[PDB]
Amino acid sequence: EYIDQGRNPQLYTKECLERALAKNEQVKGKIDTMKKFKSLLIQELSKVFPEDMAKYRSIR
Amino acid sequence: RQLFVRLLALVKWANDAGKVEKCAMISSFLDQQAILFVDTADRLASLA
């Protein structure tokens, strides 16, 4: 399709680079959200049941 | 003119033949990761 379009694959390369940058940004955002969720879960555990907090901190 | 365009396309494909395969593999891996993440999010939302 890109060959019949009449252009080179350089535009496809730039689009792939932009998609990779967007995927890296989305992965960073998802990792930040997962870290925030883990922090909130640890806080809820420490405020509710210290047994699970001690297990995750020393036993794991 | 058509032959010149075809030769330019062939040259652009031959100068970046392995790079094209690497970019395709990277794009496929990124798409698979995004699909897996979306599926996990949908499953978590449906379960919760």
Binding site: T33, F37 | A41, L44, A45, A48
Partner: peptide, 29 residues
């Protein structure tokens, strides 16, 4: 009343609301 069922239902509703809020914030001042 003052029975265990009231507090149980309250805790269940709170847990359900927390789960719904977490699901909403995970796929989104």
């Amino acid at each position: 009343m003052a029975d265990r069922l009231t507090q149980l239902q309250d805790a269940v509703n709170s847990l359900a609301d927390q789960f719904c809020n977490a699901i909403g914030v995970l796929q989104q001042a």
